[PDB]
């Protein structure tokens, strides 16, 4: 119940396609700190399933290489809230999106919401969106964030943001 | 170009005493992304000299312990800019301060200012000052920062902030 503003009326079909992890933030520094930190993941593809779930394709830097991971976000009552079981998290929350430009989401472990909160700013094109970053920074002030990372367009197009 | 509004009319004698590194930001992630990162330093005390220079007592995680380091900032013709050469930096810029609550400063290598820029938000007491942090983020809006770190009161009182 830390993250309160979830997008009421999210249409999961319109978020399908390619995305880029433009910026990310977390409540615990060490979970996002290093290149191989456990919550340092880069979203590639969001693909809703026929069952109404959401498949999240992301890359993660593991053992001196960029590894491909897939994680199923299963629907719940709340349209913008999904349940998962990867990265020691169990919930995906969509804060806001306009589908065409940007999407803001957070991940949480409901058992330890203050230490597991990690949020990201996704963008449709591999460029910096000042309007997406501003909406991203505005959502973070209400959240207990202690680390913020930003990436340039060149890194958005490299494997694991180089 | 990057650091614009260095402070006007700074009295270096009034910044004396203990400080705590409440938040920090760097232009490249790798400059701060770890405790052993080259620009991950925690200011403990500012000690102005009779010559008008500024001496910096800080902590740095070196060879598996929190080491004591000390930086003499030589005065220049402009009051809010000092010359150093430690941590591979050569310039200290005081952006703004109210002397008895907060102080914002940046360090740079003048040869490569965008590859070496690190800024910090210092506070007098080991407590979160959202109003000092807001001035810090406000001064950072003009800067090409890609990593931002902030710390809680318990971390402010520990060696190397954990």
Give DSSP secondary structure letters for chain A. Answer: -------TT--GGGG-EE-EEEEEEESSHHHHSSTT-TT--EEEEEEE-TTS-EEEEEEEEETTEEEEEEEEEEE-SSTTEEEEEETTEEEEEEEEE-SSSEEEEEEE-TTSHHHH-EEEEEESSSS--HHHHHHHHHHHTTTT--EEEE--HHHHTSGGG-
Q: Are A93 and A78 in contact (CB under 8 A)?
A: no
Task: Report residue B82 as tokens.
Answer: 């000092």
Chain B interface test: which of A27, A29, A154 (most B C-beta within 10 Å): A29
CA distance B28 to B36: 15
Please give the C-alpha separations between residue A16 and each of A46, A53, A87, A105, A120, in angstroms, as whole numbers.
Answer: 5, 12, 22, 14, 17
CA distance B127 to A109: 27
In b/e form, how buried is each residue of B64-80, taking b as 16+ CB within 10 angstroms? eeeeeeebbbebeeebb
CA distance B20 to B156: 6
Instruction: Say whether A149 and B152 touch across the interface (CB within 8 A).
Output: no
The whole-angstrom distance between B61's CA and the closest CA on chain A is 15
Torsion angles phi and psi, residue A154, rounded to 5: -60, -40
Q: Specify the long-range contacts of residues B129-134, CB closer than 8 Å, at least 24 apart.
A: B129/B22, B129/B101, B129/B102, B132/B22, B132/B101, B132/B102, B133/B22, B133/B23
CA distance A124 to A22: 10
A chain contacts of residue B148, beta-carbon cutoff 8 Å = 147-148
CA distance B118 to B104: 11
Domains of chain B listed by start with CATH number: 1-162 (2.40.128.20)
| Angstrom resolution of this structure | 2.0
B chain contacts of residue A146, beta-carbon cutoff 8 Å = 149-152
Q: B160 touching A, CB under 8 A?
A: no
Q: Are B133 and B102 in contact (CB under 8 A)?
A: no
Q: A148 touching B, CB under 8 A?
A: yes
Residue whose tokens read 């000299």: B49
Longest dimension (CA), chain B: 41
Instruction: Say whether A149 and B34 touch across the interface (CB within 8 A).
Output: no
CA distance A79 to A100: 19
Q: A143 touching B, CB under 8 A?
A: no
CA distance B147 to B135: 17
In b/e form, how buried is each residue of A35-68, taking b as 16+ CB within 10 angstroms? bebbbbbbbbebebeeeebbebebbbbeeeeeee
Scanning chain B, the segments in alpha helix (DSSP H) are 113-116, 130-140, 153-156
Instruction: Say whether A148 and B152 touch across the interface (CB within 8 A).
Output: no
Q: B33 touching A, CB under 8 A?
A: yes
A chain contacts of residue B150, beta-carbon cutoff 8 Å = 145-147
Q: Where are the beta strands (DSSP E) in chain B?
A: 17-18, 20-26, 41-48, 54-62, 65-75, 81-83, 91-97, 102-108, 118-123, 147-150
Give the CA radius of gyration of chain A.
Answer: 14
The whole-angstrom distance between A63's CA and the closest CA on chain B is 18
* Residue B23, beta-bridge partner list: B121, B150
Task: Report residue A19 as tokens.
Answer: 């995305």
Report the residue from A34, A35, A149 with minimal CB separation from B146. Answer: A149
Q: Are A109 and A2 in contact (CB under 8 A)?
A: no
């Amino acid at each position: 119940l830390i993250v309160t503003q979830t997008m009421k009326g999210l249409d999961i079909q319109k978020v399908a396609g390619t995305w880029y992890s433009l910026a990310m933030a977390a409540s615990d520094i060490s979970l996002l700190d290093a290149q191989s930190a456990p919550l340092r993941v880069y979203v590639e593809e969001l693909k809703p399933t026929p069952e109404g779930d959401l498949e999240i394709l992301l890359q993660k830097w593991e053992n001196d290489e960029c590894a491909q991971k897939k994680i199923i976000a299963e629907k719940t009552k709340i349209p913008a809230v999904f349940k998962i079981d990867a990265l020691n998290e169990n919930k995906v929350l969509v804060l806001d999106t306009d589908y065409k430009k940007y999407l803001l989401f957070c991940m949480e472990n409901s058992a330890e919401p203050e230490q597991s909160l990690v949020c990201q700013c996704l963008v449709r094109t591999p460029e910096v969106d000042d309007e997406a970053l501003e909406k991203f920074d505005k959502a973070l002030k209400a959240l207990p964030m202690h680390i913020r990372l930003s990436f340039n367009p060149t890194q958005l197009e490299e494997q694991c943001h180089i």
